[PDB]
Amino acid sequence: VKVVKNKAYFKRYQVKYRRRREGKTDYRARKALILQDKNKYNAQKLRFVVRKTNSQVICQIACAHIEGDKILAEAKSKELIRYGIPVGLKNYAAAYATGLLCARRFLKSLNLDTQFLGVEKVTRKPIKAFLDVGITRTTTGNRVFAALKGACDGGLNIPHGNNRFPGSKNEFNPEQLRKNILGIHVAEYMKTLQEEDNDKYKTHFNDYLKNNIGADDIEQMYLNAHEKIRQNPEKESKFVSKHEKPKKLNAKLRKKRVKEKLALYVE
Amino acid sequence: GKSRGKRSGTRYKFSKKFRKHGECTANKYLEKLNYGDYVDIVCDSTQQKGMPFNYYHGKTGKIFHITKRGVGVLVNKRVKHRIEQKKVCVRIEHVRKSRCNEDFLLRKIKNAELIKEAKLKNEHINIKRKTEGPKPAAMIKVPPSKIITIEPLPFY
Amino acid sequence: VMREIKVNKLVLNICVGESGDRLTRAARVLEQLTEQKPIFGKCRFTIRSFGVRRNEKISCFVTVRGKKALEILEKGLKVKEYELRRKNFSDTGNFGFGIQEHIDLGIKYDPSTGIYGMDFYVHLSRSGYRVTRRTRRRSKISKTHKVTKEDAMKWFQTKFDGILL
RNA sequence: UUAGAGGACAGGGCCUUGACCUAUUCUCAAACUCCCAAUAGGUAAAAAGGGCGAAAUAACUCAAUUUGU
RNA sequence: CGCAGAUGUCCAAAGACAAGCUCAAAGAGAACAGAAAUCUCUUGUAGACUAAAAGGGGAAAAGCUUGUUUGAUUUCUAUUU
RNA sequence: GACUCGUUCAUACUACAGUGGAUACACCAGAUCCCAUCAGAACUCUGAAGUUAAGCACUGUAAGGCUUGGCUAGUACUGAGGUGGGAGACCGCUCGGGAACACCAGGUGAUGAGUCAG
Ligand SMILES: [Mg+2]
Ligand SMILES: [Mg+2]
Ligand SMILES: [Mg+2]
Ligand SMILES: [Mg+2]
Ligand SMILES: [Mg+2]
Ligand SMILES: [Mg+2]
Numbered sequence: 001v002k003v004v005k006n007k008a009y010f011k012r013y014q015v016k017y018r019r020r021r022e023g024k025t026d027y028r029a030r031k032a033l034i035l036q037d038k039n040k041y042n043a044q045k046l047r048f049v050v051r052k053t054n055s056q057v058i059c060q061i062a063c064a065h066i067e068g069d070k071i072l073a074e075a076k077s078k079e080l081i082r083y084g085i086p087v088g089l090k091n092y093a094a095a096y097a098t099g100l101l102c103a104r105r106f107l108k109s110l111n112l113d114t115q116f117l118g119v120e121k122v123t124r125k126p127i128k129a130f131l132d133v134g135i136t137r138t139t140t141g142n143r144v145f146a147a148l149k150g151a152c153d154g155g156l157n158i159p160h161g162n163n164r165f166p167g168s169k170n171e172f173n174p175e176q177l178r179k180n181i182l183g184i185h186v187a188e189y190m191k192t193l194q195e196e197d198n199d200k201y202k203t204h205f206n207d208y209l210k211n212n213i214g215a216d217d218i219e220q221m222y223l224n225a226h227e228k229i230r231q232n233p234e235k236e237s238k239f240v241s242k243h244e245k246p247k248k249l250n251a252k253l254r255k256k257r258v259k260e261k262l263a264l265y266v267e
Numbered sequence: 268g269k270s271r272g273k274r275s276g277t278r279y280k281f282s283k284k285f286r287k288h289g290e291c292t293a294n295k296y297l298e299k300l301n302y303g304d305y306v307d308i309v310c311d312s313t314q315q316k317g318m319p320f321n322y323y324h325g326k327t328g329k330i331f332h333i334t335k336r337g338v339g340v341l342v343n344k345r346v347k348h349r350i351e352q353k354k355v356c357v358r359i360e361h362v363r364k365s366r367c368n369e370d371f372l373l374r375k376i377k378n379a380e381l382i383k384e385a386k387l388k389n390e391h392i393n394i395k396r397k398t399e400g401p402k403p404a405a406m407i408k409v410p411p412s413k414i415i416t417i418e419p420l421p422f423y
Numbered sequence: 424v425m426r427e428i429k430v431n432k433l434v435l436n437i438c439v440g441e442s443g444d445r446l447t448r449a450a451r452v453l454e455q456l457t458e459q460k461p462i463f464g465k466c467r468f469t470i471r472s473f474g475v476r477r478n479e480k481i482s483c484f485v486t487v488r489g490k491k492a493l494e495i496l497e498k499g500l501k502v503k504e505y506e507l508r509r510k511n512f513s514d515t516g517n518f519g520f521g522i523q524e525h526i527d528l529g530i531k532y533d534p535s536t537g538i539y540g541m542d543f544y545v546h547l548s549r550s551g552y553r554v555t556r557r558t559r560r561r562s563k564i565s566k567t568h569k570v571t572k573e574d575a576m577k578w579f580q581t582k583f584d585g586i587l588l
Numbered sequence: 589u590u591a592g593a594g595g596a597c598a599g600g601g602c603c604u605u606g607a608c609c610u611a612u613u614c615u616c617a618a619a620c621u622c623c624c625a626a627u628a629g630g631u632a633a634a635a636a637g638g639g640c641g642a643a644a645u646a647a648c649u650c651a652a653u654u655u656g657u
Numbered sequence: 658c659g660c661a662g663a664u665g666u667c668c669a670a671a672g673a674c675a676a677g678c679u680c681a682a683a684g685a686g687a688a689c690a691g692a693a694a695u696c697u698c699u700u701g702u703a704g705a706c707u708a709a710a711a712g713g714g715g716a717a718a719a720g721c722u723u724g725u726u727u728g729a730u731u732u733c734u735a736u737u738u
Numbered sequence: 739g740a741c742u743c744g745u746u747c748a749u750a751c752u753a754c755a756g757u758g759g760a761u762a763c764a765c766c767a768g769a770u771c772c773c774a775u776c777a778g779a780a781c782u783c784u785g786a787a788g789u790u791a792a793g794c795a796c797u798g799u800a801a802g803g804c805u806u807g808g809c810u811a812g813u814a815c816u817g818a819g820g821u822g823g824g825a826g827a828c829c830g831c832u833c834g835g836g837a838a839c840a841c842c843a844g845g846u847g848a849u850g851a852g853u854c855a856g
Contacts, residue, residue, distance in 0.1 A: 001608085001609075001683070001684065002608090002609070002683085003609085003610090004682095004683085004700070004701065005700090005701090005752075005753085005802090006802095007802065007803075009702085009752095009803095010751080010752070010802060010803045010804085011622075011803070011804090012286070012622090012702075013286075013702065013748085013751070013752090013803085014286040014287070014288060014289075014702065014748095015702095015747070015748050015750080015751055016716095016747085017747055018745095018746090018747065018748095018750070019744080020717080021747095021750095021751090022560065023558075023559055023560035023561060023717090024559075024560070024743095025743090025744085026717070027293065027717095028717085028718090030293055030744095031293045031296055034293060034296060034297070035296040037335045037336075038300060038333050038334065038335065038336065038337075038338070038359060039333040039334060039335070039649095040649065040650090041299065041300075041649095041656080041657085042649085042650085042655075042656045042657075043649075043650060043655090043656080049742080049743065051742065051743085053741085053742090053762095053763075053764095054763080054764070054765095054766095055762095055763095055785095055786090056741095056762090058741085058742060058853095060742065060743065060852080060853095062743060062744085062851095063851090064297070064743095064744085065297075065744090065850085065851085066294055066297050066745085067744090067745065067849090067850050067851090068743085068744045068745055068849085068850035068851055069743060069744055069745095069850085069851070070743095070744095070850085070851050070852080071742085071743070071851055071852040071853080072852090073852095074742080074852060074853060076741095076742095076853075076854075078762095078854080087785095087786090088785090090783095090784085090785080091784085092772090092783085110651090112651080116651090124651065124652075125650090125651055125652085126651065127651045128651070132743095135558065135559045135717085136559075136781090136782095137558075137676080137677080137781065137782090138676090139772080139773055139774080139781075139782060140772065140773065140782095141771095141772035141773055141782070141783075142772090142773090142782075142783095143782095143783085155651095157651085165772095166771090166772045166773090167772065168772095169772095169773090176772085180771095180772080185770085185771050185772080185783090185784085186771090186784070188770075188771070189770050189771065189784065191770095192770055192771090193770075200768090203767090203786090203787075204767085204768075204784080204785060204786085205784095205785075205786095206785090206786065206787085207785085207786070208785095235853095238856085239739045239740095239760095239855080239856055240739080240760095240856080241739055242739095242760095243739095243757090243758060243759090245757095245758090245795085245796045245797080246756090246757075246796060246797045246798090247796085247797075248796095248797070248798090248846090249797090249798080251843090251844065251845085254798095254799090254800075255800075257798095257799095257800090258800050261800095262800090271738085272738090273737090273738060274712090274713080277712090277713075278712060278713070281712095281713060281714090282712095282713060282714090283713090283714080285621095285622065285623095286622095286748095288702095288714085288715085289715090289716095290715090292745090292746095292747085293744090293745095294745075305631075305632080307631090312713065312714060313714060313715080314714095315714075315719095319737090320737060320738065321738090322738095323737095325629095325630075326630065326631080327630065327631040327632090328631085332735080339735080339736090343630090343631095353736090353737080354735075354736055354737085355736085355737070356735080356736065356737075365631075365632090367630090367631045367632050368631085368632060368633095369632095370632080370633080371632065371633055371634085374633085375634075375638075375639085376639095379639080396633085424789070424790095424791065425765090425766090425788075425789050425790090425791060425792095426791040426792080427791095431779080432697090432777080432779070434687095434696065434697060435696095436687080436695065436696045436697085437688095437695090438688095438689090438690085438694070438695045438696080439695095440689095440690090440694065440695085457776090459776060459777070460776050460777095461776060462776050462777095464694095464695050464696075465695090466694060466695080467694095468693085468694085470693065470694065472693085472694095473690095473693085473694055475694060481694065481695060482694085482695045482696080483695095483776095484695080484696060484776085485776055485777080486697095486776065486777050486779085487776095487777070488777070488778095488779070510686085511686075511687080512686080513685050513686040513687095513697095513698070513699095514684090514685055514686085514698095514699090515685070515686085515698050515699055516698080517685095517686070517697070517698060518686075518687090519686065519687040519696090519697080520687070520688085521687060521688035521689090522688065523688055523689080524688095540688040540689065541688075542687045542688070542695090542696065542697095543687075544686080544687060544696070544697050544698095545697090546697060546698070548698095549791075549792080550765070550766080550791085550792085551764095551765055551766090551791070551792040551793070552779090552792090553765070553766090553779085553780095553793090554764090554765080554792070554793050555793095556779065556780060557780075557781095558677095558717080558780080558781080560793080560794095561793095562792090562793055562794085563793085564792065564793085565791090565792060565793085566753090566754075567755095567791085567792090568791065568792050569699095
């Protein structure tokens with residue numbers, strides 16, 4: 001069988017961009033998101049970056065300069081422990097709260113928080129930013145649209161539609177979105193898994209019982225966390241490395257390793 | 268019959284280079300332009316909207332109009348006994364900020380401080396550039412053991 | 424340790440070679456066997472000897488996983504009384520075999536439905552196979568992590584206590 | 589487009605000639621190209637202008653009666 | 658009245674937008690099945706496809722499959738060949 | 739010790755190997771709910787029992803490729819002059835410019851902004 005990865009194969013090869021090669025950046029979405037009118041100059045068109053890893057969610061504000069974009073605000077999901085929310089930091093509600101934190105922190109850095117009050121407990125012109133969703137696909141109920149709702153509940157203006165919220169394929173129902181914001185769906189899962197297969201309830205929600213969080217007080221902790229986040233959004237006020245990384249050799253050292261290997265083979 | 272189309276005779280001009288295909292980078296969309304700037308027109312064949320004409324590939328001009336994604340450029344062209352000003356409208360991918368001007372700008376900036384210092388000490392300053400000229404005399408030390416004699420070579 | 428070999432899936436395939444009533448009856452047979460809706464395959468070409476045309480339905484197949492797959496495999500292997508040829512194992516780590524009559528699987532005969540054959544194929548693999556199928560940062564599996572032809576035969580013998588010819 | 593060499597489905601009953609693969613070897617292209625001259629081309633080299641500050645005018649632009657132009 | 662060729666057409670989609678996907682080919686393997694039917698798996702810089710000559714362009718697309726549509730709409734300027 | 743958004747777009751790729759897991763990145767446990775299929779494989783949602791086997795990070799191959807120098811070589815080619823040579827085909831001199839393949843040697847990255855743990 002004729003080998004296909006010839007020398008001529010490697011000579012003619014053209015490589016993609018590193019971040020496309022790594023499966024991180026789109027580069028068709030990105031350029032359509034950064035480009036502005038060439039005669040509307042000295043305007044930067046900020047974007048709102050939402051990334052959800054495994055066990056955490058992230059929010060950021062970017063600026064897209066020529067030597068590398070600049071971050072103006074940032075909030076991670078694991079910060080919510082300080083605001084009174086123990087484990088459960090991947091939820092729809094967790095994403096909403098993380099989106100609220102980023103907005104509140106961004107407003108205070110500019111000293112505009114007292115002029116842009118946003119909206120109260122869940123139910124000038126504002127600063128604008130466009131949603132950057134990354135690689136995931138955007139179905140109805142995707143968590144990136146909860147972070148958007150949380151950021152808009154702050155002072156920021158993020159343009160959007162209404163058909164991608166939970167239960168809103170063809171009819172917008174605010175009650176379903178509110179229930180998902182407060183974690184009612186998780187509490188109902190806790191309720192229903194208790195009646196039947198009670199041992200699976202004890203295994204599945206092992207850290208909910210351990211941290212003294214029951215199905216009856218899920219909504220209240222989120223309602224309290226929202227108020228605490230609004231009250232104070234300011235960010236809170238050499239490692240050992242027991243293992244060590246091997247280093248590279250040089251040309252002279254490599255020759256002697258060949259000398260030794262050949263000599264050992266000789267006999 | 269004769270065939271004079273719009274893209275005729277551009278087989279090699281309008282083709283990508285080796286191992287350099289694909290659309291442009293994202294930083295190309297962050298370039299700054301202003302009225303009166305010098306600019307180079309270089310066609311990028313992977314964007315088929317608003318391409319320049321064959322003749323103008325590689326020329327330099329001045330900006331007279333900026334739009335949402337376009338730039339107007341003033342370019343000279345020889346027609347048979349005179350030079351005519353042409354108004355070329357192209358899209359933003361086929362546009363590059365010209366580098367033909369930079370030595371003059373650096374020269375102005377750098378000569379400013381030399382003038383300011385010379386007048387501050389009340390000296391006499393000359394700032395015009397100097398053409399390469401004849402070389403002065405010097406004494407060159409060479410040991411006799413280092414001069415090697417050569418002669419023409421025989422044929423082989 | 425967590426590099427043990429499980430079953431990724433199982434695909435049952437019946438190629439009838441014609442469309443119409445017989446293809447639908449084969450689809451019904453597959454549905455009763457699997458409790459799933461099968462789909463159909465279509466010819467990419469037109470061959471005069473076989474009498475088939477492009478875009479024309481020729482066959483029906485279905486894929487199963489989980490607990491359900493291991494018992495359909497059990498039944499099929501039982502019809503073979505746990506003996507397979509050594510040629511049946513590919514060099515990437517999968518295997519398969521065929522059957523002549525669908526009655527011997529325990530499905531009650533029906534005079535209208537008729538008789539049909541099918542194929543079995545397994546696709547063994549370890550865990551961590553997700554990284555080659557996910558969208559975000561898909562990558563390649565290292566060579567040691569793959570399942571070689573001998574690992575496939577050892578797995579078969581140890582699990583089903585079958586013998587190779 | 590010439591020729592051998594080394595390897596692991598056709599053949600006359602373990603060897604023709606092959607087929608397939610691997611590294612070589614003689615010779616070529618207006619309508620072939622990894623590379624690439626000499627010559628021939630284009631723009632620039634300061635006063636109706638440039639640099640650095642303050643103020644005033646807009647129905648344009650910006651989250652902005654200061655953001656910019 | 659040099660050389661090798663093409664034009665007087667065709668398309669309610671083969672026009673617009675979005676999303677998901679990846680193609681030619683080879684190898685190994687699976688009842689009837691064989692050189693070629695349909696199924697998995699490995700490799701795969703485009704060796705496919707893109708209405709019609711030839712050249713240029715194209716891979717989370719400009720190619721394939723779906724979903725919704727009529728920007729193939731009325732009026733005016735600065736201009737290139 | 740790690741992560742998010744970028745810039746150079748192979749010194750950054752490819753094939754085999756070796757080593758690593760405080761927090762993090764992953765594989766991973768499930769399908770009531772939003773959502774999705776022939777198929778909870780993929781996509782979407784809810785979790786925290788197990789593991790560095792794989793992804794990922796660093797290093798190693800007289801590794802292929804890529805990249806930088808040296809040589810090839812004042813060689814091949816070429817602008818201006820000639821009442822220069824030669825039947826011609828072609829080739830020197832004067833005033834100037836000057837390659838490519840191959841071969842040999844070194845190398846396999848660097849960096850902007852913002853966070854987490856300690
Ligand atoms: Mg997109
Ligand atoms: Mg030659
Ligand atoms: Mg191409
Ligand atoms: Mg697309
Ligand atoms: Mg390991
Ligand atoms: Mg090497």
